[PDB]
C-alpha cells in the first residue's frame, strides 16, 4: 500500500510506499520498559550535607541522673540522634546512588520501532488523546519544503486538520498543583503534534506553537514518541522525512527489524473457521441438581422414588 | 468441629497460565486452551501446558538434534515450544518441516535452503490444531550449569563440585583426607 | 522500587520478622568468614571441601601469554570455510585442488579430535595435533601440516 502526500494547502499531490518499520509488532510492555530506564538517565543527583547534625559536641550522660541515655550537649540538650531535634538522619542520602540504568541496543531499537508503528493507527492515536476527527490520513505526510513565519506554519496545520489539537494544547496552560511551582516547574500544557523533518527549514516557524515538538529524522527520540509512556503520538511528516525512513534503517549496521506477527483479530478469525470447527465434539449432558426435601411430606414427592406405593406416605 | 487432617495431604500449586507480558504468548495459550475444551485431545493438553513454562523449563533445540530424532519418520511435523538454533558442526542438513516458537536467523536460512518449512504456532493452529501427524519434542531440561552444583560437595556420596575456588587439600584428596 | 518491597508490609508488627525470643542483634556469629574450623565446621565440611591447607607448586610470576593455548575440534573446521564455497568443495572431492585451512589465522594452535568430518579431502595447517585428530583426518584423505 501507499501513503498519501498533501500540499501545504490540503489537496492530494503524490503517493509514497509504506516504509517497512510500520510492520513491527505492537509491544506496550517493551515500550514501557525502555521508557522507564531512559527517563531515569536524565536525573540530577541530590543529597544532604555530610556534616549535617555532627558539627556539635555531645556525649551521653549515662545512667544515674534520671534521664534517657542519648548524647547531650553541654547543658543537657538532646543531640546527635535521628529522634532529636537537630540531629543527623538515620541513614543520610548519598550521591553514590545508581542514578542511570542500562538498556541493550537491540531493545532500544525495538522500542522506537514499536512506538513508530503505533503512530500509524487512527484508533490508537485517538485513544492516546489527540483530536484527529478532521484529518485526511493518520500516516500524515505533507509537502511544506520551507517555513519561516509562524503565521504561515499555522496556516498549514489548519489547511490539513490538526488545528483543533494545537488549540487543545493552547487553552490548557495552568499553574500546577503542588510544591513543584516553587521549583521552576510552574506551568503545564498538554502535548500536541510532532513534526519530523529531514532537509527543510521548518523549526523557526513551528517551534513557538503551544504543544509542538521538532525531530530531525536521523535521530528520533522515544521520550517524544511516547509521552507519559503511552505510545500513539500524532506525527506530521515532511515529505523528505517520510521518504528517508528506509534509508535510515539501512544505515544501522547488521540490524534487521523484528518479525511481524498476528493479532487477536487474526486469532479470533481462525477458531471460527471450518478447519478448526470440524474437530469439535460436544460434552456429555451435565448432572442435574435439586435441593433436599422430605419425600414423606406428600404423595407426589414420595412417588418420585417409589411409584408403586408399598411404602407408607406417612 | 470436623477432622480433615488424617489421611489428607496439602494441596498443590502449578502454573495454570503463562506469566509472560508478551501479547503473542497470551494469545496463543488462550487459543489452544479453547481447542482442548472442545476436543478433549491429550495432544492439545500437553501443548497447552508447555506454553505456561518458565524458560528454564523450555531449553532450546538444535537442527542436528532434530535431524537425528526425525530420522526414518521424515514426513512428520516436529513441534517445539521453544527456540530452534543452528548447529554449524553439521555440514549438511536434511529436508524437514519444523514448527517452533522462534527460529534463529541463521537456522531459518539453512532450513529453507534444504527445502524445509518453518511454521509458526498460529500456522499450526489453523491447519493442524489437534496434532495429526505431529510429534511433540523438547530439549534436555538438565543441561544448565546451575543444576550441576545442586547438593552437598563434601559428603561421601555426592559427585558434585563446589562453587568458589578452593586452593587447599583438606577433604579434597578423597576419603581419609580430612 | 521501595513501594513493592517485603519490608514495608511489616509496618505495625513490632519486630520486622526477626522474632521475639531471639531478636535482631549486631553480629551473633562474628564478622565475615571467621570460625570455619571451630563453630562453623559443620558448614565448611558440608559445602567447601579443600578450603584449608596447601596444594602443589607455586610460581612467583606467571606469564599469561605463554600459557595461553587455544584449541579447535575437527567438527568445527568446515564452519571456518564461508558458506558460499562449501558446496563446491564437497561437490568435487579433489586431490589436486583440495581446500587449505590455516587455523592460526583464525586464532587456534592445537587441533583436537572430537566429532567427524565429511567425505572430502582437505588440508589443515596448525602448530600441534592430537593423535586421533590426525587419525580421523588421514581417514578422509586429508593431510596435517605444521606452520610458522
Amino acid at each position: 500500500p501507499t501513503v498519501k502526500v498533501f500540499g501545504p494547502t490540503g489537496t492530494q499531490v503524490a503517493e509514497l510506499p509504506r516504509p517497512k518499520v510500520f510492520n513491527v509488532p505492537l509491544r506496550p510492555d517493551i515500550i514501557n520498559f525502555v521508557h522507564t530506564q531512559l527517563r531515569k538517565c536524565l536525573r540530577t543527583p541530590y543529597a544532604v550535607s555530610r556534616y549535617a547534625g555532627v558539627q556539635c559536641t555531645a556525649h551521653s550522660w549515662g545512667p544515674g541522673r534520671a534521664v534517657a541515655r542519648l548524647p547531650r550537649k553541654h547543658g543537657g540538650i538532646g543531640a546527635y540522634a535521628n529522634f532529636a531535634r537537630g540531629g543527623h538522619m538515620a541513614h543520610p542520602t548519598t550521591v553514590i546512588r545508581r542514578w542511570c540504568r542500562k538498556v541493550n541496543l537491540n531493545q532500544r531499537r525495538y522500542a522506537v520501532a514499536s512506538a513508530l508503528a503505533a503512530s500509524a493507527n487512527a484508533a490508537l492515536v485517538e485513544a492516546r488523546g489527540h483530536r484527529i476527527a478532521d484529518v485526511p490520513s493518520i500516516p500524515l505526510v505533507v509537502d511544506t519544503d520551507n517555513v519561516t513565519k509562524t503565521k504561515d506554519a499555522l496556516a498549514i496545520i489548519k489547511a490539513v486538520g490538526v488545528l483543533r489539537d494545537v488549540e487543545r494544547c493552547k487553552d490548557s496552560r495552568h499553574i500546577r498543583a503542588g510544591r513543584g511551582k516553587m521549583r521552576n516547574r510552574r506551568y503545564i500544557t498538554r502535548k500536541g503534534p510532532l513534526v519530523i523533518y529531514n532537509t527543510e527549514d521548518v523549526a523557526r516557524g513551528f517551534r513557538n506553537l503551544p504543544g509542538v515538538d521538532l525531530c530531525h529524522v536521523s535521530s528520533i527520540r522515544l521520550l517524544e514518541l511516547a509521552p507519559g509512556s503511552h505510545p500513539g503520538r500524532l506525527i506530521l511528516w515532511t515529505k523528505s522525512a517520510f521518504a528517508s525512513l528506509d534509508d535510515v534503517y539501512a544505515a544501522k549496521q547488521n540490524y534487521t527489524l523484528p518479525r511481524s506477527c498476528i493479532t487477536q483479530t487474526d486469532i479470533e478469525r481462525i477458531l471460527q473457521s471450518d478447519a478448526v470447527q470440524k474437530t469439535f465434539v460436544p460434552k456429555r449432558d451435565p448432572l442435574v441438581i435439586e435441593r433436599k426435601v422430605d419425600p414423606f411430606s406428600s404423595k407426589e414427592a414420595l412417588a418420585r422414588l417409589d411409584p408403586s406405593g408399598t411404602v407408607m406416605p406417612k | 468441629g470436623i477432622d480433615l487432617k488424617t489421611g489428607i495431604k496439602k494441596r498443590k500449586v502449578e502454573r495454570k497460565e503463562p506469566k509472560s507480558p508478551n501479547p503473542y504468548i497470551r494469545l496463543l495459550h488462550n487459543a489452544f486452551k479453547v481447542v482442548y475444551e472442545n476436543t478433549g485431545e491429550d495432544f492439545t493438553k500437553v501443548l497447552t501446558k508447555r506454553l505456561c513454562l518458565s524458560k528454564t523449563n523450555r531449553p532450546v533445540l538444535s537442527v542436528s538434534r532434530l535431524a537425528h530424532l526425525m530420522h526414518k519418520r521424515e514426513d512428520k511435523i516436529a513441534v517445539v515450544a521453544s527456540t530452534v538454533t543452528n548447529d554449524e558442526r553439521l555440514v549438511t542438513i536434511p529436508r524437514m518441516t519444523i514448527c517452533a516458537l522462534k527460529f534463529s536467523a541463521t537456522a531459518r536460512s539453512r532450513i529453507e535452503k534444504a527445502g524445509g518449512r518453518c511454521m509458526s504456532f498460529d500456522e499450526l493452529l489453523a491447519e493442524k490444531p489437534t496434532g495429526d501427524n505431529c510429534v511433540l519434542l523438547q530439549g534436555r531440561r538438565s543441561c544448565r550449569a546451575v543444576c550441576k552444583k545442586f547438593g552437598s560437595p563434601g559428603r561421601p556420596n555426592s559427585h558434585v563440585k563446589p562453587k568458589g575456588e578452593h586452593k587447599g587439600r583438606r577433604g579434597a584428596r578423597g576419603r581419609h583426607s580430612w | 522500587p521501595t513501594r513493592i518491597r517485603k519490608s514495608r508490609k511489616r509496618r505495625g508488627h513490632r519486630q520486622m520478622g526477626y522474632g521475639r525470643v531471639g531478636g535482631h542483634r549486631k553480629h551473633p556469629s562474628g564478622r565475615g568468614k571467621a570460625g570455619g574450623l571451630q563453630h562453623k565446621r559443620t558448614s565448611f565440611d558440608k559445602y567447601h571441601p579443600g578450603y584449608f591447607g596447601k596444594l602443589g607448586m607455586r610460581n612467583y610470576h606467571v606469564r599469561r601469554n605463554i600459557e595461553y593455548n587455544p584449541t579447535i575440534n575437527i567438527d568445527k573446521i568446515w564452519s571456518l570455510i564461508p558458506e558460499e564455497q562449501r558446496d563446491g568443495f564437497l561437490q568435487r572431492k579433489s586431490t589436486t585442488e583440495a581446500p587449505v585451512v590455516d587455523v592460526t589465522r583464525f586464532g587456534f594452535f592445537k587441533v583436537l579430535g572430537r566429532g567427524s568430518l565429511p567425505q572430502c579431502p582437505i588440508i589443515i595447517k596448525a602448530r600441534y595435533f592430537s593423535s586421533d585428530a590426525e587419525k580421523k583426518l588421514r581417514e578422509v584423505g586429508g593431510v596435517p601440516l605444521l606452520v610458522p
Partner: peptide, 30 residues
C-alpha cells in the same frame, strides 16, 4: 544449609576520613 561462593571483596578504606577515594562520573558528558 547455605551453599554460596565466598565473596572476594576488600573492605572499604578511608570512608569518613582520609583522602577521598570515591570518584564520580557526573562530569563525563561535560
Amino acid at each position: 544449609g547455605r551453599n554460596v561462593a565466598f565473596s572476594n571483596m576488600r573492605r572499604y578504606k578511608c570512608t569518613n576520613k582520609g583522602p577521598n577515594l570515591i570518584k564520580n562520573w557526573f562530569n563525563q558528558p561535560a
